[PDB]
């Protein structure tokens, strides 16, 4: 149990128009679950369970 609810986010300053493109592209990427497979490639440990 952690003491914050924070989130990493990609930053482009003032993001003229491209903010609308990139955020729907992120929701597209979350809409397919390949992000979960990328966690299986990168963000999986052995000694927790």
């Amino acid at each position: 149990k952690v003491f914050a609810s924070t989130g990493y986010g990609i930053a482009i300053q003032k993001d003229s128009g491209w903010k609308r493109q990139v955020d729907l592209a992120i929701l597209q990427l979350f809409g397919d679950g390949e992000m979960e497979e990328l966690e299986a490639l990168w963000l999986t440990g052995i000694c927790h369970n």
Binding site: A40, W42, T44, I46, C47
Partner: protein, 50 residues
Amino acid sequence: AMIIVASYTANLAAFLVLDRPEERITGINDPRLRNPSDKFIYATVKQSSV
């Protein structure tokens, strides 16, 4: 004294069979294989179908 000998027998049987730490690899889908350390010779033979 009955508390002592009962607790001693529970510590005996518990230390006899509690667990075993295990670092056995799973297979192809294990991250210490797919993203190997410098200590990891996971090599094989030459000129094989592998």
